[PDB]
Design a protein around this nucleic acid. Structure first.
Ligand SMILES: [Mg+2]
Length: 758
RNA sequence: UUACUGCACAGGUGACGA
DNA sequence: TCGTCACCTGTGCAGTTTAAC
């Protein structure tokens, strides 16, 4: 039982001698760092300036001399390590600092991919894909109570289009509307300039510009986005360009797949170990063994949570390890009590798509039969309904209509519904050309708004989806049906949980930031999701309808204390019972907000019960990765020699980085998509230090089960639903806030139990 | 906007301190 | 208002014939 990390032990001195002086104003720090450049490493921390001489020779420094033992205060040498790592790799220039980030000197994958595919072109060599390495010194705990410093290795790819803008024109590339960035970067200077309107020899005209409305073609380049790459490439190769991307995919897997990433990390450690890393000209560090997460010795640093169970009844008898297998054999969790067994669903669609939309609906409601066994039975029999009645609502609109599409949809909805009875849900079919119009004329958001105001949740769909070939459609219809059922108030499934306390509430907060363009300043909105422990099951609670970032800490505390009060009345807690409240977000809460939340919650429930509270952040973009060298992977497809998820830790592996932090593996080989899929990154689960409930292994596993609770998809989500649902709610309510005639009035009435945000 | 997954680019932002 | 450590957010494109047996 061992999981290998992407990091190496750093052997450091037991101790280092430093000169300290009080420096209450941190504004003086930058000038002093410049004054002692080259001779002293300088560092501010908690009101005092620390001075570590790294080269003999003045200037000199006042203050108290002090011994800083590395085992007690490893922040000092961790920081010096940032700069020292750069100094030890003089020939690899920093493209970013702390963490030291640099490029491979000779690797360039566009060229290697062209050669291997059999492609060529004069401008190709101006398109570059260069491996990118970062070295992050991090404090970790090899066992509880003892800290050390490791250096963790991560790899990405720099995408850059260095081609002059003049050239791309004369090859046929339409630069109209493409984003453009500076070539020369200056500290404190933005890179994005704006969009491209037209080119007049010397300079290019900008719209949606950040500042300057004009730039010299020599001072600007296309941003190295996938969009710009694909736009330029296919306009010089297609339909051969897909062969390039394939070949590029192949090249990248040579650095990103499990075995290749482990080998790249190994070679990085070997290169870094070959000489001591001077922290001072008489003081050396040394890169050592690859860090491991094991249970060898006095270390208890790796466990494997049990497989999540999908449960489809309240006794626990009907369960499965996959959502779809279990749903297809048992039907939904709430089948015995689901009230509306004959839903009427409004279908809003451009009239010119009538025949394609009828094909889609037949497949949805009545199934695709056993040639497409992913969706044979159809929505009605899948969910145990008696039938579905469609209320067909054609709309006289064409894809070329980019200004009046939304008014046409909404007028047709108004006229159809006025003459009909109540409908319980709606399906809205969208032209691809309309899906991403600005919200003032986007039919997705206007039909969503109109129908949610009226208390009618909608499942929308774009025409390319409606036209998927059947082998793909069957999977689309699994997800479509799960979300639609939940939108009709259904509960498709739960996940197992054995209650060990009398009640447990989990609340999540998610963020959305909305703007009409990148130029425009983004405005923030928030959502709140709640999950309750039931008898053997986690149950989804009610959801926020208000969404302003201002006062979000008050909203968390109001939602928790209101929920605790209703939970106490409903369940009638006994003297001595224990109640647990967990908070989830992608950022940590302020200590002051934790204290406010704890205080109010503690007073609301009172002294008759014991309160346990934990505040948890879930991170996706950290420098840690896990390698399971015992995992050989699975066939890329039945019978193939290629494999996928080689070295991928199993789903539910939990590794201890420190007392407050766990690494959670979510994407197992079974879930990994393709042979070239990179080695996955685990989630980093961090407990807020002021939490009164301290078991972060338990909280990591809880977050695991909540990825399996998403009714957007048959497959688990990338983050627990407490955060994911809140992000979807924040985005939708934030966009709706600016739609004329929107009202939230039905979100707690007709839609109180509808998962209308999926 | 059926989704999951991956990646890229851009924008910056959060928490802790004095 | 700054030092310090950290990584979050939006947008777009592509895929085992992607879709946990
Ligand atoms: Mg949805």
């Amino acid at each position: 039982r061992q999981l290998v990390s992407n990091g190496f032990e750093v052997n450091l001195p037991d101790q280092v001698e430093v000169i300290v002086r009080d420096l209450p104003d941190p504004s003086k720090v930058k000038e002093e760092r410049t004054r002692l450049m080259g001779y002293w490493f300088v560092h501010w921390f908690d009101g005092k300036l620390f001075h570590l001489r790294i080269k003999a020779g003045g200037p000199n420094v006042d203050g108290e001399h002090r011994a800083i033992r590395t085992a007690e205060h490893p922040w000092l040498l961790r920081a010096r390590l940032d700069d020292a790592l750069e100094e030890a790799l003089p020939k690899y220039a920093a493209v970013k600092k702390r963490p030291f980030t640099f490029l491979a000197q000779k690797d360039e994958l566009i060229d290697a991919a062209a050669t291997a595919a059999g492609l060529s072109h004069r401008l190709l060599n101006s398109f570059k894909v260069i491996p990118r390495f970062a070295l992050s010194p991090k404090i970790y705990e090899p066992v509880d109570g003892t800290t050390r410093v490791g250096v963790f290795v991560t790899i990405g790819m720099r995408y850059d289009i260095e081609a002059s803008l003049r050239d791309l024109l004369e090859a046929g590339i339409d630069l109209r509307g493409m984003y453009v960035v500076r070539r020369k970067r200056q500290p404190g200077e933005r890179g994005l300039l704006g969009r491209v309107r037209a080119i007049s020899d010397d300079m290019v005209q900008l719209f949606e510009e950040t500042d300057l409305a004009s730039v010299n073609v020599n001072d600007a380049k296309l941003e190295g986005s996938k969009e710009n790459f694909t736009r330029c490439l296919s306009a010089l190769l297609g339909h051969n360009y897909k062969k390039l991307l394939n070949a590029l995919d192949d090249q990248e897997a040579g650095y990103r797949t499990g075995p290749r990433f482990d080998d790249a990390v190994r070679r990085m450690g070997e290169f870094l170990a070959k000489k001591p890393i001077r922290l001072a000209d008489n003081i050396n560090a040394q890169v050592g063994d690859r860090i491991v997460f094991s249970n060898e010795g006095q270390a208890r640093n790796v466990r494997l949570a049990p497989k999540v169970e999908y449960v489809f009844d309240r006794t626990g008898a009907k369960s499965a390890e996959y959502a779809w297998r279990g749903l297809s054999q048992f039907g939904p969790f709430d089948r015995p009590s689901f009230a509306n067994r004959s839903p009427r669903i409004l279908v809003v669609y451009p009239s010119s798509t009538q025949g394609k939309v009828e094909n889609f609906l037949s497949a949805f409601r009545d199934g695709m039969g056993s040639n497409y066994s992913g969706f044979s039975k159809g929505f009605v029999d899948l969910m145990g309904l008696t039938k579905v009645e469609f209320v067909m609502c054609p709309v006289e609109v064409s894809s070329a209509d980019r200004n009046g599409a939304h008014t046409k949809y909404n007028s047709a909805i108004e006229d159809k519904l006025a003459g009909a009875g109540e409908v319980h849900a709606g399906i809205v079919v969208l032209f691809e050309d309309h899906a991403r119009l600005p919200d003032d004329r986007n039919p997705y958001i206007h039909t969503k708004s109109l129908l949610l105001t009226l208390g009618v949740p909608t499942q929308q769909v774009r025409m390319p989806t409606v036209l998927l070939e059947p082998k793909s459609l069957q999977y689309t219809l699994q997800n479509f049906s799960i979300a639609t059922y939940a939108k009709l108030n259904g509960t498709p499934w739960t996940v197992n949980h054995d209650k060990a306390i009398n009640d447990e509430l989990v609340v999540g907060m998610g963020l959305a930031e909305l703007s009409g363009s990148r130029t425009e300043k983004r405005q923030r909105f928030v959502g709140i999701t709640t999950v309750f422990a039931g008898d053997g099951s986690y149950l989804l609670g009610n959801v926020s309808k208000e969404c302003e970032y201002e006062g979000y800490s008050d909203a968390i505390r109001e939602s928790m204390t209101g929920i605790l009060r209703e939970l106490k009345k409903r369940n009638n807690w006994r003297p001595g019972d224990t109640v647990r409240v967990v908070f989830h977000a992608h950022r940590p809460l302020k200590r002051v907000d934790v204290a406010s939340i704890v205080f109010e919650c503690t007073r609301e429930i009172g002294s008759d019960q014991n309160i346990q509270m934990a505040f948890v952040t879930v991170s996706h973009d950290h420098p840690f990765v896990l390698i399971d060298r015992s995992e050989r992977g699975l066939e890329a497809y039945k019978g193939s020699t290629a494999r996928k998820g080689v070295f991928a830790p199993p789903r539910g592996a939990i590794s201890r980085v420190g007392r407050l932090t766990r690494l959670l593996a979510v994407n197992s080989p079974q879930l990994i998509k393709r042979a070239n899929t990179p080695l996955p990154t685990p989630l980093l689960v961090s407990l807020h230090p002021d939490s009164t409930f301290k078991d972060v292994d338990y909280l990591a596993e809880q977050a695991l089960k909540f990825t399996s609770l998403s009714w957007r998809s048959t497959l688990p989500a990338a983050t627990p639903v407490t955060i994911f649902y809140s992000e979807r709610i924040a985005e939708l309510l934030g966009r709706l806030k600016s739609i004329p005639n929107w009202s939230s009035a039905n979100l707690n009435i007709k839609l109180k139990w509808s998962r209308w945000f999926l």
